[PDB]
Amino acid sequence: SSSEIKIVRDEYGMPHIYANDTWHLFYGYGYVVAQDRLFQMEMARRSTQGTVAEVLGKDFVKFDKDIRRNYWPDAIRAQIAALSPEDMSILQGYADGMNAWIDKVNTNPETLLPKQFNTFGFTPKRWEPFDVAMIFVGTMANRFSDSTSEIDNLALLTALKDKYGVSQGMAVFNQLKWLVNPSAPTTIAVQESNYPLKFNQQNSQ
Amino acid sequence: SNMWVIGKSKAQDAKAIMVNGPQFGWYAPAYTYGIGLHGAGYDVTGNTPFAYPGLVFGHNGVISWGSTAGLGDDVDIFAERLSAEKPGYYLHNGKWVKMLSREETITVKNGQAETFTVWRTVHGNILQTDQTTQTAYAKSRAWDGKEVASLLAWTHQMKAKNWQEWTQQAAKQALTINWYYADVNGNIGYVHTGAYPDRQSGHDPRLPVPGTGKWDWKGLLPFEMNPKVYNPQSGYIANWNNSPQKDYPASDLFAFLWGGADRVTEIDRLLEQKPRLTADQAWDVIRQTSRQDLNLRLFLPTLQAATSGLTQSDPRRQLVETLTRWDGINLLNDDGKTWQQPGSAILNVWLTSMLKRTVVAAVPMPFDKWYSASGYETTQDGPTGSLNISVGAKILYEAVQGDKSPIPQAVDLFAGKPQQEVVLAALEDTWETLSKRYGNNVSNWKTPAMALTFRANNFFGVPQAAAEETRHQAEYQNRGTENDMIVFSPTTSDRPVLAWDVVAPGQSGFIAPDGTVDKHYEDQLKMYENFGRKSLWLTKQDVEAHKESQEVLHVQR
Ligand SMILES: [Ca+2]
Numbered sequence: 001s002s003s004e005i006k007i008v009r010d011e012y013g014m015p016h017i018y019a020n021d022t023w024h025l026f027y028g029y030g031y032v033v034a035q036d037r038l039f040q041m042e043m044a045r046r047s048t049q050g051t052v053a054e055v056l057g058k059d060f061v062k063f064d065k066d067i068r069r070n071y072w073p074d075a076i077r078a079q080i081a082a083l084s085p086e087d088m089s090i091l092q093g094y095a096d097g098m099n100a101w102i103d104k105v106n107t108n109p110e111t112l113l114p115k116q117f118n119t120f121g122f123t124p125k126r127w128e129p130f131d132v133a134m135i136f137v138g139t140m141a142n143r144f145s146d147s148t149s150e151i152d153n154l155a156l157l158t159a160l161k162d163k164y165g166v167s168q169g170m171a172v173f174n175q176l177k178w179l180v181n182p183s184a185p186t187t188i189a190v191q192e193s194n195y196p197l198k199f200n201q202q203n204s205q
Numbered sequence: 206s207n208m209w210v211i212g213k214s215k216a217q218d219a220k221a222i223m224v225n226g227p228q229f230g231w232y233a234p235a236y237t238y239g240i241g242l243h244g245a246g247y248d249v250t251g252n253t254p255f256a257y258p259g260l261v262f263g264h265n266g267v268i269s270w271g272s273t274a275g276l277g278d279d280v281d282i283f284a285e286r287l288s289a290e291k292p293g294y295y296l297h298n299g300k301w302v303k304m305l306s307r308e309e310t311i312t313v314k315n316g317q318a319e320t321f322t323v324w325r326t327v328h329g330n331i332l333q334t335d336q337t338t339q340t341a342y343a344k345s346r347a348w349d350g351k352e353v354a355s356l357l358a359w360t361h362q363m364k365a366k367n368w369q370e371w372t373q374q375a376a377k378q379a380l381t382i383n384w385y386y387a388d389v390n391g392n393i394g395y396v397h398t399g400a401y402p403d404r405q406s407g408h409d410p411r412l413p414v415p416g417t418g419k420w421d422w423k424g425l426l427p428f429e430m431n432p433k434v435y436n437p438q439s440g441y442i443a444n445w446n447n448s449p450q451k452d453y454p455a456s457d458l459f460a461f462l463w464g465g466a467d468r469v470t471e472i473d474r475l476l477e478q479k480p481r482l483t484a485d486q487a488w489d490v491i492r493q494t495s496r497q498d499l500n501l502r503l504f505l506p507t508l509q510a511a512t513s514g515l516t517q518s519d520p521r522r523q524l525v526e527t528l529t530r531w532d533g534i535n536l537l538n539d540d541g542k543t544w545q546q547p548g549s550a551i552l553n554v555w556l557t558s559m560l561k562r563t564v565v566a567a568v569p570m571p572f573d574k575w576y577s578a579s580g581y582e583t584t585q586d587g588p589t590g591s592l593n594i595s596v597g598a599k600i601l602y603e604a605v606q607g608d609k610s611p612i613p614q615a616v617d618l619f620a621g622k623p624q625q626e627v628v629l630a631a632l633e634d635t636w637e638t639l640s641k642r643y644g645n646n647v648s649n650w651k652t653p654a655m656a657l658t659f660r661a662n663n664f665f666g667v668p669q670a671a672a673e674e675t676r677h678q679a680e681y682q683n684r685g686t687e688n689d690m691i692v693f694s695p696t697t698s699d700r701p702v703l704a705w706d707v708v709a710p711g712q713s714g715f716i717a718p719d720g721t722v723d724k725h726y727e728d729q730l731k732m733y734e735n736f737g738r739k740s741l742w743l744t745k746q747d748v749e750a751h752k753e754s755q756e757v758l759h760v761q762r
Binding site for chain 2: 018044064074087154172
């Protein structure tokens with residue numbers, strides 16, 4: 001039946017969700033997550049949105065500001081607003097499923113509230129698709145796809161130029177932070193293919 | 206993060222074998238979450254970080270997938286032109302343009318709230334401003350605006366049944382991430398996914414560019430340009446955050462380099478060792494690489510050459526002989542706290558001295574400390590992530606290779622002295638440092654082993670559990686936070702696919718109000734420690750046969 005969600009856990013407690021439409025499937029997923037990792041997910045949400053100080057104090061004010069300064073929330077919301085009903089169902093279903101369990105938790109905290117909530121002095125609130133999306137954006141996009149030191153690289157290059165002179169300073173920079181190194185082991189063998197682009201390595205800008 | 210995919214031509218007793226070791230550091234509760242989805246077009250099993258809708262590690266009975274960080278350059282910094290007369294504006298294409306801004310308030314428990322402003326231009330959020338030069342730096346990410354599409358691509362890819370359907374989704378993932386594929390017929394594949402900018406001519410991607418217009422990106426490069434391979438002649442695909450392809454450039458981050466010295470070689474050595482590998486042999490590569498000192502291979506030849514003419518009683522020579530007799534694999538002594546051989550300590554002390562004498566000496570402060578690390582840095586809880594050859598060591602390797610290095614040595618790191626002289630001097634420092642701590646008899650040196658800790662604070666440094674929930678393992682292992690293996694078309698089984706993973710400490714992080722820990726709070730911890738694994742179930746028959754519990758819901762959307 002269209003409204004049925006069957007959840008089965010194996011010998012290690014790993015859940016398997018059975019459902020007939022997108023929203024129900026992800027609802028099942030969100031529900032088991034709320035059962036297994038509610039405190040971890042709540043803290044990850046605060047981590048990815050910069051709302052840790054609200055529950056942990058002044059030690060995390062700089063952290064929260066740093067997180068907010070590194071993204072543009074309205075832009076993420078706009079991406080969500082442009083999704084098709086089918087894609088939206090993934091995010092909506094997921095959030096709705098976690099809410100069903102969170103609601104149960106807040107109704108019978110005496111037995112269902114994870115101890116950490118009591119330890120850290122606060123209770124869990126509901127989630128929205130934006131929150132689900134931000135778990136991914138803040139922990140995959142910002143941790144594994146936002147690496148750069150260009151400003152400091154420029155400072156290094158300036159310092160090198162001051163110590164060794166213009167042309168030599170540029171050459172040393174190329175020795176310490178080369179653009180490409182042809183002896184680097186490559187996952188794809190050279191016989192298969194090579195990258196066709198050649199890049200400037202003289203700060204021509 | 207590492208991965209090795211073995212195709213039809215290199216697999217023994219199977220058509221394909223995929224082994225993934227994503228490295229995110231170690232936490233309690235588990236960094237990843239186990240999940241199976243069946244319905245609405247999906248039929249999958251595996252585990253994924255933070256329980257994202259899309260499984261980053263898993264299979265659907267037809268194909269299997271995994272990932273490792275790409276480390277490509279998809280972020281450039283634009284130097285915006287400001288004006289003291291027009292605050293909140295910047296010069297772009299001949300006009301003073303208005304910056305977007307938003308106010309944010311940080312509520313603080315037991316404290317006073319703080320509000321500040323976040324500024325943004327056509328090139329991205331402003332990172333810092335320099336009123337002196339009246340410059341504001343904006344961070345431009347090639348994936349900006351495709352964050353949600355990337356999450357969705359990682360979800361829809363789970364439904365793919367072949368290379369064509371899978372790459373269609375790979376082309377929609379915009380973050381710099383290496384994606385891997387294997388299937389029931391023995392095919393294997395790789396795609397260095399992500400959006401990369403199509404830059405103007407002369408744009409040096411390691412340094413900022415002016416934001417006034419002329420240096421704006423032309424757009425994004427097409428998917429055809431993303432490095433990729435399907436069924437390579439080698440019969441395998443290996444990666445440990447190394448270069449995807451010849452001539453492909455890495456991230457501009459100073460600490461990241463793809464050069465002659467790379468840890469992925471350790472994987473290659475093991476895969477090329479024998480003509481074919483069985484699933485057990487493929488899994489065993491985790492154990493070996495997790496215990497392999499990464500510097501021995503790189504500097505032992507140099508050390509041997511330098512000590513070639515010394516006498517038997519010379520301590521410099523004795524330290525190298527110790528290294529020569531070792532394969533670089535670290536093993537704990539029966540005390541469970543020290544390593545059997547002192548090689549890693551010898552290399553750490555030697556390498557630290559060498560860097561101080563070469564790379565560090567050639568770089569002006571305070572940038573010199575960017576190249577002083579030996580790669581053995583840790584905490585008392587052990588390393589926070591994987592171990593790698595340090596950036597200083599990679600540069601030093603190019604210098605010790607001499608003419609064999611394709612990198613012109615603009616400055617001689619040995620400053621006109623014979624390399625042997627500097628190598629011997631570092632060895633003299635090494636002997637003095639270690640002999641002072643352990644005595645003169647090397648054979649009795651019990652050097653401390655690095656340990657591993659499942660931390661209660663998540664990678665951001667934010668508590669995700671109570672401190673007391675921290676868990677410790679005696680043996681540090683340079684391996685995936687989780688390890689998963691998928692084996693297609695096994696000849697030793699009638700099943701079309703076999704899969705296993707390990708999610709430590711356990712599937713559940715739940716603790717009841719009275720302190721009662723969930724039944725699956727720590728049942729994968731020992732399994733993790735000794736390289737064990739548990740079966741991942743996919744089919745209804747297997748799931749029902751291994752069923753521990755069930756709950757059926759009827760929900761009205
Ligand atoms: Ca760049």
